[PDB]
Design a protein around this nucleic acid. Structure first.
Ligand SMILES: [K+]
Ligand SMILES: [K+]
Ligand SMILES: [K+]
Ligand SMILES: [K+]
Ligand SMILES: [K+]
Ligand SMILES: [K+]
Ligand SMILES: [K+]
Ligand SMILES: [Mg+2]
Ligand SMILES: [Mg+2]
Ligand SMILES: [Mg+2]
Ligand SMILES: [Mg+2]
Ligand SMILES: [Mg+2]
Ligand SMILES: [Mg+2]
Ligand SMILES: [Mg+2]
Ligand SMILES: [Mg+2]
Ligand SMILES: [Mg+2]
Ligand SMILES: [Mg+2]
Ligand SMILES: [Mg+2]
Ligand SMILES: [Mg+2]
Ligand SMILES: [Mg+2]
Ligand SMILES: [Mg+2]
Ligand code: NA
Ligand code: NA
Ligand code: NA
Ligand code: NA
Lengths: 68, 197, 229, 49, 145, 128, 144, 96
RNA sequence: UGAAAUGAGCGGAGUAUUUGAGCUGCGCACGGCGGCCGCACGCACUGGUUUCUUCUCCGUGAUGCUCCAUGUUGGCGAUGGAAAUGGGGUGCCCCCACCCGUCUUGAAACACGGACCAAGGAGUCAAACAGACGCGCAAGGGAGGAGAUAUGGUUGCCAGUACUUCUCUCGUACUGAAAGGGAGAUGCAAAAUGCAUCUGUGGUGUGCACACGUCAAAUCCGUUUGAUUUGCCCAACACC
RNA sequence: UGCAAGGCCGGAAAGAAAAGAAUUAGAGGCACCAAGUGGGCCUUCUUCGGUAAGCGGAGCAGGCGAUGCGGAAUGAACCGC
RNA sequence: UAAGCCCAAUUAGUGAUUGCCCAUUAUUCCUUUGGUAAGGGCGGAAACAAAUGGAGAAAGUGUAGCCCUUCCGAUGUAGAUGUGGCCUGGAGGUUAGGACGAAGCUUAUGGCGUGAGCCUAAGAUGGACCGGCCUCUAGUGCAGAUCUUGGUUGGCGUA
């Protein structure tokens, strides 16, 4: 009952039927988890300040539109 | 013979009819098929496409969500211009977490009794799609809105829960069972909560 | 009597008819002028080349002909037993069927593509008569994703929406001289579907130099294609 | 091969055909041949000289 | 409140008047000028309707529903009879006074009604001429009241 | 009544598609059954075997369903059925159902004669 | 209905969608959840992690009536108040009274903004809920 | 074989240029049946009534370089019992 | 067979027209040789000449949404046990053409099951769960058991249908082994439960429609169809 | 005032020149729910074990399986298609 | 003086550059079918009896497909899916037929459908039930299981 061990025949054709999908672009799934901790911690504070500034900017824009 | 390998892979499943048995849904589809083919507006085309869709793809929207998005739009809108008509191809449901809402004109396939009461009591109007086609035939000054699908319990179960980076709920009737091995680091490995993609 | 909307339709239709007739006349005049200019250009170029060759020969010099810019490529093999690389190259060349023909630019990127699929395709350098016959007798455009035979210049004008391409002579000139709209003109066309060569082939399996058919035949592709078109 | 379609696609074909007929005229052909041979021989001789 | 569009959606596939025999979809509707099972010709369903019918002699009746008494079935349809010799274009105009989208079929139906009346008279005359020469052992006469 | 004229009726095939090897067994009906055998010559489409039905044999939609007389057969069971064929009498011909008795068929034929409605199976003596 | 099942479409197929090679055999992989640790381990491990093992204490004779403790949030408190009472409710004035144990709840949690001030009678409460409802002009009264 | 087209060899026609002369000419296969059936001029010419029958066709193109011709018969193929039998190639429709 | 003949083909006009070939002008390219010579006659003047070579110029929407319906000359058919044309039957020619169902890498197999016919004969029912699709309602949904009375009536219809539920169940909250806790925004601040306010997407990128515009093309001049700026971005998705 | 990071505000944009200076019968992504498979066999070249084998084992790619048709008389898989 | 082998022609030193024959291939024409299909029309246009041009025109997934025009594809084991797809026994509706003949049964018995099938005709058959359409439902389709039961059968007028 000796059978055949292993072959790679038809594997490339199967992989290329629904062809080799390209990689996810670098603007997607750019998670920083596992990276160098000090830079991550500093960037978190910078992003805190940026979020507060964005809220302030939106409030100023609303006030200006109401004024005009 | 012409070499056309992988030519059925290019074709997509497009449905031009509704599985719905509702005669009124059929009437709306007839009217908006006419409007979509005879008018240049893209609003009619999008509404006609959404009328064909299934119930699971026409997710319900909430009155609080409508109020919030319409406020975000009402700011940065001139005081002379009127507020748009909030049009949803779906159901509008009341939100008990928002008691104070403005007077908005809302068009939908169905309103819950509480949502209709809240919209009318706030000073607004509950419109139907024939009324919308009557007053805004090309859908000018309308806010086309959609309901949320990502929070559905079916969506939270999709995918294998035993692969790293997966937080899908297992199909289990017992919550206590299926919590020991593969869920705990102590009991012979734990599924990794994060995977870089 | 006629209803008011019917009278409005009638008046607008009369105006449309007169405008369509005027546009047809204007396009006919434009095509006449463009064809006259192109024919004079071709004749002058031929005469200038003849004179240059005579001047080079009369003093012991040689005249080096300009390397051909356009090639005409036909597929002389079927769709069975093709390796993936050759299959991809032929798909990108749009030769997905036997006796399918295309016009390509004879630059380095396309020459290196032709060399890899030489056993399946016979190519060469088209002549003005070959280009004109292919456009006039086997000319089909892609209008709304449909294979539409070229029957008048209005279809060409509408399809290309270019000032420089309004007529079949514009398309022939672009294809023949490898103009700035060669890619536009050739991509807006369906690949030519030719009949088998009357009188037969020599040998499908050997190069033209070897006594067969699958190589580059230089300007003999015009003789080959006259029996196919 | 169709007059209608060829004239629709090329309004100048009526003049190209007339040029072809004039070229195929036997008297024109012979006169043109002798004139062309004379001109080319004269120009070649003047070039070598 | 319930429109002809909705009623057609309801009754298009099942109706006592839909006669799908073989593969052909005809209509038993008394107010159908055609016999075709279409919304335009479903006269029992439309708000306004008109149908061309025969009458005694060569007369042609036009039965008209104006939509005024649609909730009272005894008053929904009114018959107006044009005497023999009426022009089919006049009958079609009488129909188009209600349904302008039925004028062509009404003209054709009035012409057909006149043709049927004439052919019926001719066939009856020939049949009587033939039957005059037969013994006919049994004759049945309905009693008078 | 004369039927409406149409283009010449062309049948792609006149022979019926019959079951494989139905002539060798009295059990098997001649009605078509798709051969699913792995080594079936009819399924493999050998040169000398019988053909199988497909879309290519479909008949022209202009002349489909038209009988040799030029009409289309509409089954009828009584006199009142003859009145929906009154206006399209050049397109449809009535076919009295088989189980309609002679007593009712007499009235149906008599009415159709006056209405000028063609009957596919009326008495041949009438209408010549 | 039987007329809609796949058995009617497969009349004449001779295999009914199970193949000539593999066939439809009785029990080719065991019965039930057999082999969850061997020859079905990939399925069990990737689709139902945590299935095998032990965890936690044992609570002999667990009565769930003693543990009954439903919760309601602050933004959901308008479900338990009639519309007209919420119309008149305002901070600093007469406020509707909500009995949570009669309405079916034991603990008040306090997520989100409270839409209508009130006096909530609750068995349990969160510190955030208590603070928020006191800020909003309402109150919590402990009950049992 | 494809029975829709027949090959006919005419006497003294031994070249393709010779067979091109007969393109379009009418062709007849004369045979007989067992019973006298209807014919042309069955009533006008009762002397014509016979068991003799004829199938007509036309020359379409030459076949090979040796003067054979392809023939198409009217509506139906020629019977295989006509193989090796006499055929009449008439001189009309005339072009000379 | 002209039931819209779109024609270099029809129908009107006109004797012309331009376009080739000659032959030529000027400048310029081009070729010897170092500013002169040549130039087969390229390019511009759409240069000239007219010596011979071609015909050129106008014309008809659909008030027809769709389909069908219009020659000639014979033969045969003047109502018949008939003329056709199709269909059916049986023979015969010339070509094709291994026996089916299986298992198998491979069956026409010297692989296995196959004398005939009739009747019978194989994905079912229930339970749990999931996904698609239909329908109801919606921060709620729904029972079940059971009672009531039309019916406490009726052979039966009616084991149905109508009605009801402080309950029960599944949701609207989740975590922890437990003991136990228990999710809004913004502002101001930085209190080991900080305050204030509450018409509101926590932020960012990418994203329907819609709103102002802006271009390009085509228009029967009304527009419509593409792109695009900005705003708000719905559903989504990605980072916080 | 330098770096590093997250923003914001501008600017410019052959939207990619010229040098043989691409081409495309190029709608990209993204889910959900399932079935058959999971004995394979033939070549061209490359290749290992074996004296070899219509022998056993690999690589790349095609083909039979699953598929007829035209051609090598005949032949799973050769030639053409 | 190949009908063998190597080479080379295409009617042969004459005047150019396709001898001929065979595909489920190519090109083209006609028809069907299905599209990730592409478009038009769909506010009856005016008129118009018979005796003696006609009809139809449905805002539409799927039909005898609403009609017209256009383009492209069409083989396939295991397997998947679709089908105003076929067929069977009952149920709820509806609409018919029958002693002037119901089911059943018979067929050189035609017609229709690509097919599953459906319909008519005839019976020198039968003798009382039964068809269509819409929905529901299931013990719902046989060619073969060394299938079950019944009948028949060649061997065989044989051993
Ligand atoms: K992080
Ligand atoms: K096989
Ligand atoms: K509840
Ligand atoms: K093959
Ligand atoms: K089609
Ligand atoms: K439909
Ligand atoms: K049986
Ligand atoms: Mg959620
Ligand atoms: Mg090869
Ligand atoms: Mg009977
Ligand atoms: Mg299966
Ligand atoms: Mg298996
Ligand atoms: Mg075996
Ligand atoms: Mg053997
Ligand atoms: Mg939950
Ligand atoms: Mg196996
Ligand atoms: Mg009219
Ligand atoms: Mg249709
Ligand atoms: Mg197929
Ligand atoms: Mg299958
Ligand atoms: Mg039963
Ligand atoms: Na048939
Ligand atoms: Na025969
Ligand atoms: Na079987
Ligand atoms: Na015996």
């Amino acid at each position: 009952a000796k059978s055949k061990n292993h072959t790679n025949h038809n594997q490339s054709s199967k992989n290329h039927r629904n062809g080799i999908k390209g990689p996810v672009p670098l603007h997607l799934h750019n998670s920083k988890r596992g990276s160098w901790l000090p830079a991550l911690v500093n960037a978190r504070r910078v992003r805190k300040h940026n979020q507060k500034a964005a809220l302030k900017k939106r409030r100023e824009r609303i006030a200006a539109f109401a004024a005009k | 013979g012409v070499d056309l390998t992988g030519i059925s892979k290019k074709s997509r499943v497009i449905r031009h009819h509704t599985y719905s048995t509702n005669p009124y849904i059929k009437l709306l589809i007839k009217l908006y098929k006419f409007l979509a083919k005879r008018t240049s507006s893209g609003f009619n085309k999008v509404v006609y496409q959404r009328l064909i869709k299934s119930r699971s793809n026409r997710a319900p929207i909430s009155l609080s969500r409508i109020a919030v998005v319409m406020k975000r739009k009402a700011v940065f809108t001139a005081k002379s211009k009127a507020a748009p008509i909030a049009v949803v191809v779906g159901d509008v449901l009341d939100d008990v977490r928002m008691a104070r809402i403005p007077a908005m004109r809302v068009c939908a396939l169905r309103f819950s009794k509480s949502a209709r009461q809240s919209i009318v009591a706030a000073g607004g109007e509950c419109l139907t799609f024939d009324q919308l086609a009557m007053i805004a035939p090309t859908g000018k000054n309308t806010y086309l809105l959609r309901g949320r699908k990502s929070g559905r319990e079916s969506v939270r179960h999709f995918g294998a829960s035993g692969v790293p980076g997966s937080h899908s709920k297992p199909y289990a009737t017992n919550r206590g069972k299926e919590t020991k091995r593969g869920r705990r680091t102590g009991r012979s490995y734990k599924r990794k909560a994060f995977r870089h993609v | 009597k006629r209803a008011a909307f019917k009278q409005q339709q009638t008046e607008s239709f009369k105006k449309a008819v007169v405008a369509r007739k005027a546009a047809k006349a204007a396009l006919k005049k434009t095509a006449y002028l463009r064809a006259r200019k192109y024919s004079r250009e071709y004749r002058g170029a031929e005469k200038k080349l003849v004179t240059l060759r005579r001047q080079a020969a009369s003093h012991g010099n040689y005249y080096l002909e300009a390397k051909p810019k356009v090639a005409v490529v036909t597929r002389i093999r079927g769709i069975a037993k093709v390796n993936p690389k050759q299959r991809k190259i032929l798909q990108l060349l749009r030769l997905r069927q036997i006796f399918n023909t295309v016009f390509v630019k004879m630059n380095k990127p396309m020459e290196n593509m032709l060399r890899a699929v030489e056993p399946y395709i016979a190519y060469g350098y088209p002549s003005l008569a070959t280009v004109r016959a292919m456009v006039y007798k086997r000319g089909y455009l892609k209008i709304n994703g449909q294979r539409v035979k070229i029957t008048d210049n209005q279809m060409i004008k509408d399809k290309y929406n270019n000032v420089d391409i309004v007529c079949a002579e514009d398309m022939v000139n672009q294809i023949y001289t490898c103009g700035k709209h060669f890619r536009t003109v050739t991509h807006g066309m369906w690949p030519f579907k030719l009949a088998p060569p009357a009188g037969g082939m020599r040998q499908k399996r050997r190069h033209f130099v070897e006594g067969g058919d699958y190589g580059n035949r230089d300007t003999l592709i015009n003789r080959f294609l006259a029996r196919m078109i | 091969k169709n007059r209608r379609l060829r004239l629709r696609l090329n309004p100048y074909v009526k003049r190209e055909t007339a040029a072809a007929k004039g070229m195929r005229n036997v008297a024109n052909r012979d006169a043109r041949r002798k004139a062309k041979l004379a001109r080319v021989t004269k120009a070649k001789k003047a070039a070598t000289k | 409140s319930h429109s002809v569009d909705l009623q057609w959606v309801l009754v298009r596939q099942n109706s006592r008047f839909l006669q799908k025999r073989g593969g052909i979809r005809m209509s038993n509707d008394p107010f159908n000028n055609n016999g075709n099972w279409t919304k335009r010709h479903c006269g029992f369903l439309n708000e306004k309707a008109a149908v061309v019918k025969p009458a005694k002699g060569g007369a042609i009746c036009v039965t008209v529903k104006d939509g005024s008494s649609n909730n009272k079935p005894r008053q929904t349809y009114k018959k107006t009879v044009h005497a023999a010799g009426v022009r089919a274009s006049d009958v079609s105009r009488a129909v188009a006074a209600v349904r302008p989208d039925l004028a062509d079929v009404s003209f054709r139906r009035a012409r057909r009604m006149a043709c049927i009346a004439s052919r019926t008279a001719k066939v009856a005359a020939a049949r009587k001429a033939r039957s005059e020469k037969i013994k006919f052992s049994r004759k049945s006469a309905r009693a008078k009241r | 009544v004369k039927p409406t004229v149409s283009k010449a009726i062309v049948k792609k095939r006149t022979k019926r598609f019959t079951r494989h090897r139905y002539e060798l067994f009295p059990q098997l009906s001649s009605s078509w059954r798709k051969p699913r055998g792995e080594d079936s010559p009819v399924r493999r489409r050998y040169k000398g075997q019988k053909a199988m039905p497909n879309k290519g044999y479909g008949s022209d939609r202009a002349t489909k369903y038209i009988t040799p007389s030029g009409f289309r057969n509409f089954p009828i069971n009584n006199v009142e059925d003859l009145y929906m064929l009154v206006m399209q009498n050049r397109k449809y011909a009535g076919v009295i159902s088989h189980t309609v008795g002679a007593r009712k068929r007499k009235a149906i034929v008599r009415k159709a004669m006056e209405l000028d409605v063609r009957l596919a199976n009326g008495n041949a003596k009438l209408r010549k | 209905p039987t007329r809609f099942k796949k058995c009617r479409h497969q009349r004449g197929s001779t295999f009914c969608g199970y193949g000539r090679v593999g066939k439809h055999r009785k029990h080719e992989s065991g019965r039930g959840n057999a082999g969850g640790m061997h020859h079905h381990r990939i399925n069990f491990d990737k689709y139902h992690p945590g299935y095998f093992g032990k965890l936690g204490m044992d609570h002999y004779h667990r009565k769930k009536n003693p543990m009954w403790k439903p919760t309601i949030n602050l933004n959901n408190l308008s479900r338990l108040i009639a519309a007209e009472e919420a119309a008149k409710a305002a901070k600093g004035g007469t406020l509707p009274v909500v009995d949570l144990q009669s309405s079916g709840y034991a603990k008040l949690l306090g997520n989100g903004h409270i839409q209508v001030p009130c006096i909530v009678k609750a068995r349990y409460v969160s510190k955030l809920a208590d603070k928020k409802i006191r800020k909003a002009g309402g109150a919590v009264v402990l009950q049992a | 074989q494809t029975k829709q087209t027949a090959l006919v060899r005419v006497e003294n026609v031994n070249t393709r240029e010779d067979a091109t002369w007969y393109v379009g000419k009418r062709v007849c296969y004369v045979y007989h049946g067992k019973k006298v059936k209807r014919c042309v001029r069955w009533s006008k010419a009762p002397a014509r009534r016979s068991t003799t029958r004829a199938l007509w066709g036309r020359v379409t193109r030459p076949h090979g370089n040796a003067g054979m011709m392809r023939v198409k018969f009217n509506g139906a193929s020629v019977p295989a019992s006509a193989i090796g039998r006499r055929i009449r190639v008439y001189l009309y429709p005339s072009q000379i």
